[PDB]
């Protein structure tokens, strides 16, 4: 029954290749995948090309003018292990910490390479 219950939903929700909902004329083209990384770059080189052609236009509302500017207030520093307020920073692996217990038990004896996974959260690597 459990293996046959999904077949009921399969036979109630099927749509054939001559589908009822789409138009009669199709001429379906082929499409590349074009993931989220390349769309930003092709848009960026598009606006750069249009700006260089116009220079030989001030922008009003694009993806790269909407984005939030960096802050002007000084950022707060936090402990990379616990999330509490970080008074000190280790001179070797550059990892902030709260007190001496955290340093001696986590920050000192840790393996190489875990520094990058600790600093990947705030984007400091």
């Amino acid at each position: 029954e459990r293996l046959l219950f999904l077949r009921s939903v399969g036979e109630r929700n099927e749509i054939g290749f001559p589908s009822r909902f789409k138009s009669a004329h199709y001429k379906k083209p082929t499409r590349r995948h074009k993931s989220a990384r390349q769309l930003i770059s092709d848009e960026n080189k598009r606006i750069n090309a249009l700006l260089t052609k116009a220079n030989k236009l001030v922008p009003k509302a694009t993806y790269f003018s909407v984005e939030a500017p960096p802050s002007i207030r000084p950022a707060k520093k936090y402990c990379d292990v616990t999330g509490l307020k970080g008074f000190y920073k280790s001179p070797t692996n550059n990892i902030r910490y709260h007190n001496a217990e955290i340093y001696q038990l986590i920050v000192k004896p840790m393996a190489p390479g875990v520094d990058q996974e600790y600093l990947k959260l705030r984007g400091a690597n």
Binding site: F87, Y88, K89, S90, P91, N99, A100, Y103, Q104
Partner: protein, 104 residues
């Protein structure tokens, strides 16, 4: 009875960079106790307060942040006055009991 926060420890390395005219100065300070080590980015007035009262590496100093007063306790145990390296937390809150006469 009042509490004030002080920093005491042994100086490991002092780096100070100056410009051509000396208008802006940047610096780092590496300090340690027997339980922890840290590095500090310094501002201009702390750089001026470290250049005055000449601090080299291997000196045990005490820093008061709110008043800017730095006192050299001495030199540590590296012969190559002699005091011991401080232990515990670098940032400590000590409660000092005052007694002031009414004549004062």
């Amino acid at each position: 009875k009042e509490e004030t926060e002080l920093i005491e420890g042994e100086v490991v390395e002092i780096q100070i960079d100056r410009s051509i005219t000396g208008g802006h100065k940047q610096g780092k300070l590496t300090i340690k106790t027997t339980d922890m080590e840290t590095i500090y980015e310094l501002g201009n007035k702390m750089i001026d307060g470290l250049t005055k009262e000449k601090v080299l590496a291997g000196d045990v100093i005490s820093i008061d942040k709110a008043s800017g007063k730095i006192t050299k306790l001495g030199r540590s145990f590296a012969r190559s006055r002699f005091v011991q390296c401080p232990e515990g937390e670098l940032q400590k809150r000590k409660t000092v009991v005052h007694t002031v006469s009414l004549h004062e």
